[PDB]
Amino acid sequence: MKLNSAVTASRRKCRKAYFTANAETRAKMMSSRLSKELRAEHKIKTMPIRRGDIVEIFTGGHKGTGKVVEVRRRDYKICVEGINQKARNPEAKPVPYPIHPSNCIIKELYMNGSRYRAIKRRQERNAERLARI
Amino acid sequence: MGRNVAFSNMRRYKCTNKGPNLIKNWFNQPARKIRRRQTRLQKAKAIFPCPLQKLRPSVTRCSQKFNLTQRIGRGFTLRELQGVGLSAGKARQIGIAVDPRRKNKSEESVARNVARLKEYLSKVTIFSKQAKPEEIQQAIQHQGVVMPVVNPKPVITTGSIAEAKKEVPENLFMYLRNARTARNRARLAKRDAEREAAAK
Amino acid sequence: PTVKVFGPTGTQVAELPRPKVFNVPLRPDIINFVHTQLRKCLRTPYAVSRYAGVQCTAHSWGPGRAVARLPRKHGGIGAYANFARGGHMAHPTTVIRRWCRKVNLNQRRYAVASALAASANAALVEARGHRIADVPSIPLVVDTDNVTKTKDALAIIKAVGVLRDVERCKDSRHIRAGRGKMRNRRYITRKGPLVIYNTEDVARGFRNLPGVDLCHVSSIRLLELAPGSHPGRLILWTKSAFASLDDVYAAKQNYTLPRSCITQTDIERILQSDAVQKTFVPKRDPLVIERKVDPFSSKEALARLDPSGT
Amino acid sequence: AKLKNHTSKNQNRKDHRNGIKKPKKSAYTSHKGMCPKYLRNLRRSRANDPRQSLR
Amino acid sequence: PTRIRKSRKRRGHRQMGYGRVGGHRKHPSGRGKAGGLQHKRTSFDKYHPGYFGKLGMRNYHVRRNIEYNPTINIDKIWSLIPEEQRDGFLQRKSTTEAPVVDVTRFGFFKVLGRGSLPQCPIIIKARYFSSDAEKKLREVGGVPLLVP
RNA sequence: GCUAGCGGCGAGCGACGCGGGAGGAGCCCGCCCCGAAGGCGCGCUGUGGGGCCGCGAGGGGGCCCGAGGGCCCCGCCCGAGAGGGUGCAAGCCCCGUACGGCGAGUAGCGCUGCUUGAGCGUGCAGCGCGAAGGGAGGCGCGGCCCUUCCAAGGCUAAAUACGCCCCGGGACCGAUAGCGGACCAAGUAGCGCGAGCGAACGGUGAAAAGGACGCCCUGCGGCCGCUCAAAAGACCUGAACCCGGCCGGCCGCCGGCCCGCCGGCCCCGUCUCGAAACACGGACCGAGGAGCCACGCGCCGCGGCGAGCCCGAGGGAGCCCCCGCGGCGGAGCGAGCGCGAGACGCCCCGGGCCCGCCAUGCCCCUGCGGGCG
């Protein structure tokens, strides 16, 4: 059970948080498990999804691997490259099938310079936790 | 519907829908206890060695219905204070409440309260001349009424029938009855004496 | 008699004298009354608003407009009436309802004791839905030094045979039917072991286990003792708690435990005793009712009534 | 305006429904309205010998 | 509560137990105990004798503590003695050492004589005593005594 | 406690002292003394002194499905099995959760008016009059005491009350309900000269994939089918009333029979002596729609305890645990002064006797008092 009474277990209040979250919270909420190779490399279980990330969806329709090309935060869904809806005619624009970030596992990350710093910041806080918090 | 119904002494509800709000709900009871404990805990922390409650006197409960019981009163009289040789300032500074309004009303009250002060003065320890932290931390805050007043439970003593017989008149009931009616028996006598003067 | 104490590995460790509370007469009706009154005390107040249905300005149009006589607004929309849409309730709920019932200390102390007596009764504990097949004894007392890890707590539960009950709770997790889901009561899990502790930090270890509730001996809760107003919760007593049960009752000041009474089994034996049987006298033979027949037609039927004539 | 002034119909039936109740047994022996002197003598007479419950 | 009530069993019955000829109307007999000397005189006379009028001297402020006089009986004096103490007192008799019971300490002011003291000298100390109290107390051998 | 009192002493109304707690804390000015030492452009007509931040555990294989979060096998993490999300019901997919870190025009009195339970006056107030030792003690007036205080100047924490707004929770309501208002614009749209009044309207899908292509159209648009698990196509489910196509049948209810014949059959609700009534309400259908709650009293049952009994308010790093006063009962009766119950008895009724109130004898102490009748 939860001993911090300051937090809410109300279905209505919690759902409002998800539906109406600030962008900075929406981004963390949209996170995906790193692959076991990346877990050994960066020593972090999950990273928030970015645009340039190779991802393997283990979902039911559209299971596959792809690089994210669009992150739609308002719908809370990401669009990898490759995974698309069936096209009515061959001569038509391909529509990406929106996939939940939770339905996919990251295979490669866009390291940037802020992402390197963020992995370091988390690694330090995780080490302090591992030292008997 | 009727039959034999004791009649109601209940008053009709006033300001039921419009007015001052004459309804007090007590859902705030569990949480008022919590708030009051916290206020006491925080005040207690603010003065660790000092007890929250000041010494207050043992006073007879007022009225003939509670004459032989004692309760805690607002503060010590200045005569009780002179029995321990303490000024009102010094007494308050060492946590003994002082009431300059109270007058003892009996020799017994001064002695009972003077005794109670002596117990407190021996119990009180004054931390002065630089706060030795380990010794101030070592000190234990007293919690609750300091020296709570105890009303001893009644006990059955033993006596000689003969000594008691000397103390009371025979026909105590007549003696008691003569006393209850004395003023009336004298007023009727004074009235009868005037009715006699009428003959002359 | 004595109660066997078991170790964390399920081996016998010591024998503890049975607390006298377990002999208290088992009274289901006292448990139900106190549970009902006490659960009502844990209710939160609900009420419709005082201004509900009455912020409209509605006055009756009256007789003579071929309408009904109820209060109507400016356009003739019906208002201020239980039947009307947007009208006040006929008798609006109020927060002044008595939510908490009152129980005397003596009966609120009989309920706990009788519930504990039911816990000593394996038959009642099986009927409450617990899996008691592997539990070595009921009541069960287990030595358990502070357990700060759920994995270790489960290992003691597996050894003492309470695990099947802990599993029956885990598997039970489901979504409740109704608006209970919407109103923060979404998941229902069956209730199972109860761990009563003293002088131990076994709480950190058993808290996450599913269906297990933990209480200190000093403050035992009837609602936990009799979940559903049904006596017979499986209680895992820690050696310290069960050996202090008599001290808790002794420190209940001027309280004498309800004197034990006879059971149904003991009154059948007493009725079956020879002394009662000697008093029994054999009842007089009953009337033979039979059924009407026409005697005149049959020689034999007349013969029952008129032997000579036939 | 005008309604029935009086009727007796059914009143006998209503009386006999469970009625015609005899008047107690204590009433037949009560000392209410008896001669104050005779009653004093009775008390003095029954206050002597076996009848006496004076102790 | 609500489920096990009579009004739940009156559904489908229209009037709800109040009658077709005269139904539940608001305040048919009036509001309150109004009508005592007029329309409801039969009730206020049959069951409320003494309701109307004035009967005594009026004290503007009764002093509840001067008025309070608690009473004991010659029969309950010995229950005030602790049980372990009472048996020894009963066998010894002890005119020399008989148990003085200050009823004032136990909360009582006047000693009445409802029943009967055991036959052992006692000594009772009280503000006041009845007549048949002192007679019963002194027959047992005890002395009525007054306490400040 | 809710009584004492008040009240066409009617209906009604109504404090307080005790006692138990929460919380506790005391003081100043005038007067008088000094006099400018003061807060010094003043002032001797008197100043001054006496919370944020932060990590965060552990799941696979098969079947099947549009999609597991399902089913079957088998593990793992639990100081975390509160919850929220994710394509179906997820402790281990994600977010989180548990575990952290840094005293005078006065009092009073007279007359009047308002007010109070305050009763020859509870508190006020106008006016007239106006003290010096004075106020109070719940029946006025005059005397004499006793207890107990010092008005006509001022300050003061705590315990206490409470909306907006923020935060949590609920045996609450679930779109005619719940705020009037869940709908990206509700005090809006609209109405009134104005003060003011005041609605209705939730839900496609997992994803807009929101309709491929062919055909016929002057075109509108039809068709075929397409996307989808499904059109779910401007939207979830899609009822009843009502209606149209086809398709039987001849027509209401009840009873018999193969089933269209025979037999029975007024329109309900309602007041009412009496309704098919030419009494009233009711076109139809759907939703909503009326003895609930508080408090007081009577009585009944039941549970605990028993001359007792009692989660009062409260207090216990404790709120289902512990501790915890009045009260009520145990003695009545009388306007009161006051006085004050035993003699029996399964139970019930009655009689007898005792207690109070009222009378009457008789005897006597400590006497308009005690005893006995």
XYZ file of C-alpha atoms in Angstrom, chain C residues 292-306 309-310:
17
model
C -64.005 -44.359 6.576
C -65.332 -47.365 4.596
C -68.959 -48.411 3.894
C -69.417 -51.317 6.361
C -72.793 -52.437 4.963
C -71.496 -53.603 1.539
C -68.631 -55.902 2.713
C -69.256 -58.903 4.999
C -65.730 -58.275 6.376
C -66.234 -54.501 6.812
C -69.503 -55.061 8.729
C -67.670 -57.746 10.784
C -65.274 -55.149 12.267
C -68.367 -53.236 13.616
C -70.995 -56.087 13.816
C -74.676 -59.875 12.276
C -72.047 -61.203 9.848
